[PDB]
Design an enzyme around this catalytic site. Structure first.
Site, PDB file in Angstrom:
ATOM      1  N   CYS A 127     -14.342  -5.057 -36.278  1.00 21.69           N
ATOM      2  CA  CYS A 127     -14.386  -3.697 -36.884  1.00 21.69           C
ATOM      3  C   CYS A 127     -13.439  -3.676 -38.085  1.00 21.69           C
ATOM      4  CB  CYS A 127     -14.079  -2.691 -35.782  1.00 21.69           C
ATOM      5  SG  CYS A 127     -13.435  -1.070 -36.304  1.00 21.69           S
ATOM      6  N   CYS A 138     -10.676  -1.208 -38.128  1.00 15.61           N
ATOM      7  CA  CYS A 138      -9.586  -1.526 -37.181  1.00 15.61           C
ATOM      8  C   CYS A 138      -8.643  -2.541 -37.832  1.00 15.61           C
ATOM      9  CB  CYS A 138     -10.123  -2.148 -35.903  1.00 15.61           C
ATOM     10  SG  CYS A 138     -11.174  -1.004 -34.971  1.00 15.61           S
TER      11      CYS A 138
END
Length: 127
Positions: free
Chosen positions: A41, A44
């Protein structure tokens, strides 16, 4: 300093939260890391350093649970426990949440220093 815990999946997250039941619990929900230690991600990956340098604003007797939600295939399933859990109700990763409060940051907000400071200080307003 904050008690820091890193777990993989909803059951491990659930055990950490229940074992720290007394404390001020803050959680990050992020895509699982590959063997190079990078979330699938991108948001993230971006947020991890902003969160780490704002952890110091969390109050005394706080726990920070870093929860890897699983791989992308698992995450994209709209029935997954993180999304359907009536408390977590995750819309996206990353999510920073104080479970059972409206203290929540999503996506680009998790990479914002001022927002992440306000989060750890429980100073986000929801007008």
């Amino acid at each position: 300093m904050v008690k820091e815990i890193h777990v993989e999946g909803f059951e491990a997250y659930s055990k950490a939260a229940e074992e720290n039941n007394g404390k001020n619990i803050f959680a990050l929900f992020c895509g699982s890391k590959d063997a190079n230690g990078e979330s699938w991600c991108p948001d993230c990956v971006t947020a991890e350093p902003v969160i780490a340098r704002n952890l110091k604003y969390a109050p005394a007797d706080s726990v920070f649970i870093h929860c890897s939600v699983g791989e992308r295939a698992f995450w994209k399933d709209q029935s997954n426990v993180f999304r359907k859990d009536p408390v977590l109700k995750l819309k996206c990763v990353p999510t920073l949440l104080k479970p059972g409060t409206p203290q929540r940051l999503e996506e680009e907000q998790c990479a914002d220093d001022n927002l992440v400071q306000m989060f750890f200080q429980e100073e986000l307003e929801h007008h």
